[PDB]
Amino acid sequence: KDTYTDRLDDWNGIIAGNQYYDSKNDQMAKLNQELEGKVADSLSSISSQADRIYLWEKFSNYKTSANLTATYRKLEEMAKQVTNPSSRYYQDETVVRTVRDSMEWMHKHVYNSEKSIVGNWWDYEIGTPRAINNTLSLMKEYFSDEEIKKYTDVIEKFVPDPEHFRKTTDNPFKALGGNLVDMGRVKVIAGLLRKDDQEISSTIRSIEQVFKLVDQGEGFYQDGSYIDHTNVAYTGAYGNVLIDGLSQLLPVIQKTKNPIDKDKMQTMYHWIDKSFAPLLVNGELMDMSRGRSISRANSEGHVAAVEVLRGIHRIADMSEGETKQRLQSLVKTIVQSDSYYDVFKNLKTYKDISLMQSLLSDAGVASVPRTSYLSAFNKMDKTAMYNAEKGFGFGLSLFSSRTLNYEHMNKENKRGWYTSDGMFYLYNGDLSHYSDGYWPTVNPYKMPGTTETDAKRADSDTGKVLPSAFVGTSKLDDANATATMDFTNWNQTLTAHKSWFMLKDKIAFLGSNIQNTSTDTAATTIDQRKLESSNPYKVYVNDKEASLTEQEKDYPETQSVFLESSDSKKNIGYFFFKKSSISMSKALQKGAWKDINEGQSDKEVENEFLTISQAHKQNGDSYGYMLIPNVDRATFNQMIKELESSLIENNETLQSVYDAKQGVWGIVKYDDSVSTISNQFQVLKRGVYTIRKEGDEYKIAYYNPETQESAPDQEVFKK
Numbered sequence: 001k002d003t004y005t006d007r008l009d010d011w012n013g014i015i016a017g018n019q020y021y022d023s024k025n026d027q028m029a030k031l032n033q034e035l036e037g038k039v040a041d042s043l044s045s046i047s048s049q050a051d052r053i054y055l056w057e058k059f060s061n062y063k064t065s066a067n068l069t070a071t072y073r074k075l076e077e078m079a080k081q082v083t084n085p086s087s088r089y090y091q092d093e094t095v096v097r098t099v100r101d102s103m104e105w106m107h108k109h110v111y112n113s114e115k116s117i118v119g120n121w122w123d124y125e126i127g128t129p130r131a132i133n134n135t136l137s138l139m140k141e142y143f144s145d146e147e148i149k150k151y152t153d154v155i156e157k158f159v160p161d162p163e164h165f166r167k168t169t170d171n172p173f174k175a176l177g178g179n180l181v182d183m184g185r186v187k188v189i190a191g192l193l194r195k196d197d198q199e200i201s202s203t204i205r206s207i208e209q210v211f212k213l214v215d216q217g218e219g220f221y222q223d224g225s226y227i228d229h230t231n232v233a234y235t236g237a238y239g240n241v242l243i244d245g246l247s248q249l250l251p252v253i254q255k256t257k258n259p260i261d262k263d264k265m266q267t268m269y270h271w272i273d274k275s276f277a278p279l280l281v282n283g284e285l286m287d288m289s290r291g292r293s294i295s296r297a298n299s300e301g302h303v304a305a306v307e308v309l310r311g312i313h314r315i316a317d318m319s320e321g322e323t324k325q326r327l328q329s330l331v332k333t334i335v336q337s338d339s340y341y342d343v344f345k346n347l348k349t350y351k352d353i354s355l356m357q358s359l360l361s362d363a364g365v366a367s368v369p370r371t372s373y374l375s376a377f378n379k380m381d382k383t384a385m386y387n388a389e390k391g392f393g394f395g396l397s398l399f400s401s402r403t404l405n406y407e408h409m410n411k412e413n414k415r416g417w418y419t420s421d422g423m424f425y426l427y428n429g430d431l432s433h434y435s436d437g438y439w440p441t442v443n444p445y446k447m448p449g450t451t452e453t454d455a456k457r458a459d460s461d462t463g464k465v466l467p468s469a470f471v472g473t474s475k476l477d478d479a480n481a482t483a484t485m486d487f488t489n490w491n492q493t494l495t496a497h498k499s500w501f502m503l504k505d506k507i508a509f510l511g512s513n514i515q516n517t518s519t520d521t522a523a524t525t526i527d528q529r530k531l532e533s534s535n536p537y538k539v540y541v542n543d544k545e546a547s548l549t550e551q552e553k554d555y556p557e558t559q560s561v562f563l564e565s566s567d568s569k570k571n572i573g574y575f576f577f578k579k580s581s582i583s584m585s586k587a588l589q590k591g592a593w594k595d596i597n598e599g600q601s602d603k604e605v606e607n608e609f610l611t612i613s614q615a616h617k618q619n620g621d622s623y624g625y626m627l628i629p630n631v632d633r634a635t636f637n638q639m640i641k642e643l644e645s646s647l648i649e650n651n652e653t654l655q656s657v658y659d660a661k662q663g664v665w666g667i668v669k670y671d672d673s674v675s676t677i678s679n680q681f682q683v684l685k686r687g688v689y690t691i692r693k694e695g696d697e698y699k700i701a702y703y704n705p706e707t708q709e710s711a712p713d714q715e716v717f718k719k
């Protein structure tokens with residue numbers, strides 16, 4: 001036909017990839033079989049109505065916008081198979097007619113220009129328009145240009161401006177990040193289908209906004225942080241959509257009359273290296289960056305990581321030289337380190353499957369274990385740490401006056417209340433820990449690392465920002481960093497100076513100035529670990545075996561707790577600097593995804609959890625322990641003797657831990673007094689410090705979380 005048809009061909013090759021199908025290809029045949037099964041269920045349940053109320057009973061209530069998108073996506077699946085020579089529905093007359101009559105019908109009494117948004121705007125402006133564009137693009141050889149325009153006009157009505165969304169509403173918003181990229185998958189493709197040049201260029205010009213790094217608001221930051229929805233850490237969900245979608249569009253956009261400059265897109269590599277890579281551990285995308293996505297059963301950590309990975313791979317594929325090789329190496333190593341999730345379970349197009357296969361089999365592409373790293377995403381109040389030598393990841397989830405604690409929207413993530421109240425994540429040998437139903441079964445009132453009262457919480461509640469701006473991480477190098485959070489709980493009835501000292505192969509948790517003005521009880525959850533019935537843990541308290549029950553047992557005068565597995569890479573030890581009074585329990589916890597996300601299944605799910613907590617019955621209480629993972633029993637026992645005097649101070653104004661072996665100090669100061677440390681030096685400014693001594697020279701890393709600035713050494717360090 002023309003260049004528009006040419007671009008749409010490229011698009012079809014990216015969103016479906018039928019030209020790349022090979023029946024002898026196992027992974028490919030598996031996706032084909034899934035699509036076959038999907039079309040057969042749709043065609044068999046579609047109402048052979050005499051013009052009935054709906055096309056599919058399951059998606060009948062057209063008041064629930066979700067049903068418009070689900071319906072058109074079923075037609076897209078049909079379009080994918082009708083153009084697949086290997087599908088039993090290839091060129092099938094009844095499927096071609098079902099798709100054509102279904103479009104005329106939906107366009108008749110459900111989705112048209114004379115309609116208004118009912119329910120979610122996203123379905124009307126992104127979900128449905130994408131499914132329609134894809135359906136028409138794939139089956140453009142069965143539709144007339146006039147029919148195509150006819151079926152896309154409704155998209156032009158709901159989405160006429162490539163710069164704003166919710167345009168037909170009373171309060172539209174500027175499109176950026178993930179939503180802006182979907183604006184390209186909506187208007188660039190519809191523009192191609194309609195052969196509308198102004199639409200194409202105006203939309204590509206708008207998408208280019210996505211390449212600019214920001215220092216405020218939504219978007220990617222220089223330090224690797226990604227914020228969306230005003231002030232929510234969102235690299236792992238909206239960022240996913242951003243890279244996933246942009247990578248599909250680029251090859252098509254780059255072949256139109258409005259290609260995008262090569263230096264404008266150079267920031268893509270910054271996202272990959274600074275924003276995405278640090279959040280990927282053993283093939284898992286850290287949940288602290290996925291917002292409300294965590295409450296979706298079909299998008300657990302390893303699954304969400306493939307959206308990013310397939311996006312990175314595409315980018316690598318259209319790159320060249322060492323950039324291509326290096327990105328290739330990045331994707332290869334991450335995928336191969338994932339022994340838990342089969343990457344192919346989330347590569348939904350033949351070209352994506354093909355790319356992955358050749359990548360994994362090309363001996364020319366290096367696949368070397370990733371090195372140690374520590375990212376202080378201070379612009380989104382999150383910190384990611386990875387130790388390659390011992391093999392564990394650590395995630396610190398916080399929030400402040402600059403960021404929302406959790407997102408509960410569209411009935412999703414109803415109980416994420418405390419997922420940012422100083423919650424921590426440990427990524428060890430059990431790659432499935434935060435998967436297999438962790439979210440719907442974890443007790444939402446006892447999120448690991450958090451200090452909270454036992455007051456009941458409502459599902460209808462929504463996120464809040466923190467009163468204090470004193471939240472931040474001072475990074476010294478790839479293995480050492482210190483963080484603090486001037487914590488106040490949701491109803492301002494409890495406070496705590498929570499601090500963390502990341503010291504290469506361990507993390508110290510310090511909390512002081514714990515006050516409670518309410519009548520509820522306060523306690524800090526040391527941990528709530530999801531167990532594997534296959535790899536049971538042998539629990540020790542003070543080095544003596546302990547038998548945990550469903551009922552809470554008290555362990556006063558506890559100096560240590562050790563969780564021993566047959567696999568040392570799953571071991572977790574906790575060393576209490578000062579004998580502490582803790583309680584522990586191991587109980588089967590049940591729940592359903594629908595409990596935390598209305599749109600999910602109410603099918604019962606269950607998992608065994610080991611919970612460790614320390615109550616705080618008096619004002620001015622505190623806690624202090626070192627988390628030491630991946631070492632065996634004897635090594636842990638030897639290490640706690642070494643750390644005997646690692647606690648320097650832990651009060652209302654000063655918290656510090658010293659790593660004698662490393663010669664590294666972690667310090668948090670809440671005021672400007674002169675603090676003398678280990679009779680060696682003095683720190684003089686309120687803020688966060690990570691200091692290392694090398695001979696008589698001192699390496700200083702200082703960060704004032706409030707002003708988001710460091711300071712000349714002579715201002716904060718002395719002697």
Ligand SMILES: CC(=O)N[C@@H]1[C@@H](O[C@@H]2OC(C(=O)O)=C[C@H](O)[C@H]2O)[C@H](O)[C@@H](CO)O[C@H]1O
Pocket residue numbers: 119120121122171173179229230410
């Ligand atoms: C509360 C408000 O002003 N608007 C609500 C819609 O929110 C917009 O949605 C998104 C997005 O969905 O990515 C980004 C925008 O920043 C945000 O203002 C919301 O989607 C709908 C449906 O829940 O209700 C509006 O009131």
Ligand SMILES: CC(=O)N[C@@H]1[C@@H](O[C@@H]2OC(C(=O)O)=C[C@H](O)[C@H]2O)[C@H](O)[C@@H](CO)O[C@H]1O
Pocket residue numbers: 120122123127178237238241293299307410
């Ligand atoms: C980032 C986010 O949560 N976006 C919401 C949509 O979720 C994404 O949907 C798709 C897609 O259908 O292509 C891909 C992603 O993995 C998933 O996170 C969600 O479907 C819609 C409708 O509820 O709302 C968006 O805000």
Ligand SMILES: C[As](C)(=O)[O-]
Pocket residue numbers: 410411412414459460461598
């Ligand atoms: C807003 As609601 C229904 O999830 O509680």
Ligand SMILES: C[As](C)(=O)[O-]
Pocket residue numbers: 457458459460461
């Ligand atoms: C139902 As409710 C919001 O009280 O949990």
Ligand code: NA
Pocket residue numbers: 457458459
């Ligand atoms: Na309630």
Ligand code: NA
Pocket residue numbers: 459460
């Ligand atoms: Na509710």
